[PDB]
Structure formats: structure tokens, C-alpha cells
Design an enzyme around this catalytic site. Structure first.
Site, PDB file in Angstrom:
ATOM      1  N   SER A 130     -21.649  46.029  19.094  1.00 52.64           N
ATOM      2  CA  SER A 130     -20.880  46.618  20.192  1.00 52.64           C
ATOM      3  C   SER A 130     -19.375  46.573  19.970  1.00 52.64           C
ATOM      4  O   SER A 130     -18.639  47.298  20.649  1.00 52.64           O
ATOM      5  CB  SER A 130     -21.218  45.920  21.510  1.00 52.64           C
ATOM      6  OG  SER A 130     -22.582  46.119  21.838  1.00 52.64           O
ATOM      7  N   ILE A 131     -18.895  45.749  19.035  1.00 51.84           N
ATOM      8  CA  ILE A 131     -17.467  45.712  18.725  1.00 51.84           C
ATOM      9  C   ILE A 131     -16.960  47.062  18.238  1.00 51.84           C
ATOM     10  O   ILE A 131     -15.757  47.347  18.338  1.00 51.84           O
ATOM     11  CB  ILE A 131     -17.223  44.578  17.704  1.00 51.84           C
ATOM     12  CG1 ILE A 131     -17.470  43.231  18.389  1.00 51.84           C
ATOM     13  CG2 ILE A 131     -15.824  44.640  17.107  1.00 51.84           C
ATOM     14  CD1 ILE A 131     -17.650  42.066  17.405  1.00 51.84           C
TER      15      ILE A 131
END
Length: 316
Positions: free
Chosen positions: A62-63
Site C-alpha cells: 500500500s505504500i
């Protein structure tokens, strides 16, 4: 003549050591980058027994969602208030399932970041071409080994864009199907922090009289829009409230990479809207996710703000 600040190095070490012990983790990593100069203020591996911050690669997860959104904004494919339909949190793309943690329904592009929606990231990614996304990944330094002196720094894995299947473009939009080091992620987030210009990240003090040439990754308008979205991640309604820093506006993203074994990472910046530092943390194999990495980011970011006399800019 290292740029490492002994006080910030201690802050990073003390907080990372406490977290590795609290979660009985295999290892941890933390680094702090000065946004204005690219200087590394802290760089810690715990334990010390190769520099894993530079050599170990993992899927960012998700970064990467803020970069998917950054590029679509920069290419004018969407705006922050463009609506993205995610429905009940189940999607199918070329026969493969893409899943959100809940049924988020209709989101703005900002809401896609706030809720960490895989489906929203995918649908935004589908407004772009593989070549466009690959050039963005390359501009933030992915797939290329940092040239900062340390030998054997990892390049990570970025597949050539002519070879991407549509489902692979989708998974990369939410951070799977490519690999990065924590160093690479910290450097990439300076592009969002420093008004769209990614800074050369160096462990040596910079000359205040000489010019630092960065790489323009996004326009300042895009970077400012995404910084606003990153703040919503740690505010009520966002998915990483444990990364909030009492007294300071901050923003960032959590990500998880699976090997019960996984790696919990978080990258963020402080204070908003004009950040001074990027803080990147990773806790390898704690024995969830943002609840592990987030508090380490929060402690290091807040402790560093206080040590640098940054005035609080958010009420308690």
C-alpha cells in the site's frame, strides 16, 4: 563529514530497538531524511548483524498507492474530487479478484488514499498506460541501485513495461509485483515532500553554497494535493491512526509484505503542509501491520520534531 545527526540517530535507534523488542521481531530498520537537502539524518538497522536498509528488498504494498494517485493527478487523468466506484469491495479484472478490506462504495480520489483501497488504486491505474507508470517508477528511482557509497545496494525488481499484463499493472498500482528497498521508498517519498522534486539522498553533509539538482517527478500542485491526502491516512476515517503524532500534522502510508511471517513498513513525512523530514520504518517478522509500523514512525517523527524545535501545529 557524515550528515548523520547523533541525536536523531539515537532517537531512531532507541525507538526502533523498543519496537523490535516489544513485537519480538526478527529485525527492524529506520531512516530519517532531511527534505530540504536530501541528507540522511539517521540510518539504523536493529540488530546490526550487510546494510539491510539498502540490501533487502520486498514488495512495497500500500505504500505505492500515493504514487499511483500522484501520477494520475499529474497526467490530468483524475482530480482530487474525481469519483471512483469501489462498490462492495470486490472487483474482477481479467478474471482475477481485486479486494478491499471493506465495502467502501463511492470514493473520491482522495478517499482512495484515505481508505487504502486496492480497487480504487486499480481503477485509477487503468486510466494510464504501462509506459507512463514505468517511467514514473523509474523517475522515483525504483529498479535502480542507489549510488550512495555503500557496496551491494539492491536495485529491486521492476519488470519492463512492454511485458506488463493488465492484471500486473493493476497489482503494481497497489504495490505488488515489484520489489524495493526501504532506502528506495524513503527517497521516493521525498518527491512528494519536496514539491514534486525527488532529492538525491546522501549520507554526506551538503554544501549550503552549492546547488542541489533533484529530479522533477511531479508538479508542485500534484505533490501538495497528495500531501493533503496523506494527512487523511492518520486522521479519523483513515486506516493508520496509530501513525498520528500528537501536536503535529503528519501524513504517510503503511504497507505489508508477506513472506504468519510478514514485514510491516511505514513511510511518512512531517510536519504538514511543508515537511522537514521523511521518516521510513520497517519491522520484519513481528510476533498487525500499521499497528506495528505506525507507532514507530510516530515516535521517531514526533521525537525528531521536538528535538529540532519544530513548533507544534495541531492541537491536542
Amino acid at each position: 563529514g557524515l550528515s548523520i545527526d547523533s541525536k536523531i540517530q539515537y532517537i531512531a535507534y532507541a525507538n526502533l530497538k523498543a519496537a523490535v523488542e516489544k513485537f519480538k521481531a526478527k529485525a527492524g530498520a529506520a531512516m530519517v531524511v532531511d527534505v530540504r537537502t536530501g541528507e540522511v539524518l539517521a540510518l539504523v538497522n536493529y540488530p546490526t548483524y550487510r546494510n539491510r536498509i539498502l540490501t533487502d528488498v520486498f514488495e512495497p504494498g500500500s505504500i505505492m498507492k500515493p504514487f499511483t494517485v500522484s501520477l494520475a493527478l499529474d497526467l490530468h487523468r483524475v482530480t482530487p474530487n474525481t469519483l471512483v466506484e469501489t462498490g462492495n469491495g470486490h472487483f474482477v479484472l481479467d478474471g482475477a479478484p481485486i479486494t478491499d478490506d471493506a465495502g467502501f462504495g463511492t470514493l473520491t480520489v482522495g478517499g482512495v488514499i484515505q481508505k487504502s483501497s486496492n480497487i480504487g488504486a486499480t481503477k485509477i491505474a487503468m486510466t494510464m498506460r504501462p509506459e507512463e507508470m514505468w517511467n514514473m517508477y523509474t523517475s522515483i528511482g525504483l529498479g535502480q541501485a542507489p549510488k550512495v557509497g555503500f557496496p551491494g545496494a539492491a536495485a529491486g525488481r521492476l519488470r519492463p513495461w512492454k511485458s506488463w499484463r493488465r492484471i500486473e499493472q493493476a497489482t503494481m498500482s497497489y504495490g505488488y509485483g515489484l520489489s524495493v528497498s526501504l532506502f528506495q521508498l524513503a527517497r521516493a517519498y521525498t518527491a512528494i515532500a519536496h514539491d514534486g522534486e525527488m532529492m538525491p539522498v546522501t549520507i554526506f553533509k551538503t554544501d549550503p553554497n552549492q546547488q542541489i539538482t533533484g529530479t522533477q517527478v511531479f508538479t508542485p500542485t500534484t505533490a501538495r494535493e497528495v500531501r493533503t491526502m496523506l494527512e487523511t491516512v492518520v486522521a479519523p476515517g483513515g486506516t493508520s491512526p496509530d501513525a498520528a503524532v500528537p501536536g503535529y500534522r503528519v501524513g504517510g502510508k503503511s504497507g505489508t509484505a508477506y513472506k504468519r511471517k510478514y514485514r510491516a513498513s511505514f513511510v511518512g513525512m512531517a510536519p504538514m503542509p511543508n515537511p522537514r523530514i521523511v521518516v521510513a520504518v520497517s519491522v520484519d517478522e513481528p510476533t498487525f501491520g500499521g499497528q506495528v509500523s505506525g507507532p514507530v514512525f510516530s515516535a521517531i517523527a514526533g521525537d525528531t520534531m521536538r528535538a529540532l524545535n519544530v513548533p507544534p501545529n495541531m492541537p491536542i
